[PDB]
Amino acid sequence: VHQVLYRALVSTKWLAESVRAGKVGPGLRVLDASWYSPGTREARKEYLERHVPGASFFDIEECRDKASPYEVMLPSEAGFADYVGSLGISNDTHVVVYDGDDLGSFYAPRVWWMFRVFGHRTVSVLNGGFRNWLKEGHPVTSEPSRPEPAIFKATLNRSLLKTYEQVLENLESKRFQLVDSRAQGRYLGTQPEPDAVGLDSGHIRGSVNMPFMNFLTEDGFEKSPEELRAMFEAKKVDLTKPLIATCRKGVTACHIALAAYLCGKPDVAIYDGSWFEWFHRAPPETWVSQGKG
């Protein structure tokens, strides 16, 4: 359920002109969705110091199922709806998401997919991220944003989500191509999985690896659609066939979904449980690692 695709990328120039124009409001809401591993950057404090004028902080640590044993799992429809409503977002709002990643994108695609998986098509990511917004000198502020509340209705679009059981069945059916966006070393099992206890690295049998950072240019901009298409083809990923994206915790997998969407394939589903869930639930026979093990 959607044939003509709504823009998934907006430029810094466009967003800056919109903010100059007074467009932030019910029709346009801007989110910093940054999140960092423990012991590194301070997402909320960075947002407090420097944000696009009128933007809000989208707290992924809150906007998830807290009761799950697994990482960064979708909240319920109500939890999402209540949270986004509280940021002034309704079903008529154009949501623009950025993050402060050093290359140019990490969490923002996750948030773009969250809106889509909850039925909202009017969502985009800021091409080049906050990194480029800053480099180009666009306005930043520490003034508080206080959007008026709105009502949002969320409706899960199951086709854009996969469960553990569906990935396990797929091991057998081979119906979907399973593409993992984690860095190469962790995908192969030669580098450990971080921020976890006794979680081995490796990958689900039958997977293909497409490290997420390959999607962006060295400046942090999305690669062109011709470039993206060439990447999938060189990976033996056929865009005319079904595709499930997976990673550590369902976050960077959303960069595969974004890349495929800009190549005209909106149908990629995210395995939200991802490797973290897989390792904990699946028989070890279903995964491989170079060490090995």
Curated annotation (Swiss-Prot):
N6-succinyllysine PTM sites in chain numbering: K13, K135, K174, K223, K236
GO MF terms, alphabetically ordered: 3-mercaptopyruvate sulfurtransferase activity; 5S rRNA binding; thiosulfate-cyanide sulfurtransferase activity
EC id: 2.8.1.1
Catalytic residues, chain numbering: C247
Keyword Cytoplasm: no
Residues modified as N6-acetyllysine: K13, K135, K162, K174, K223, K235, K236
GO terms under biological process: rRNA import into mitochondrion; rRNA transport
The protein's name in its UniProt record: Thiosulfate sulfurtransferase
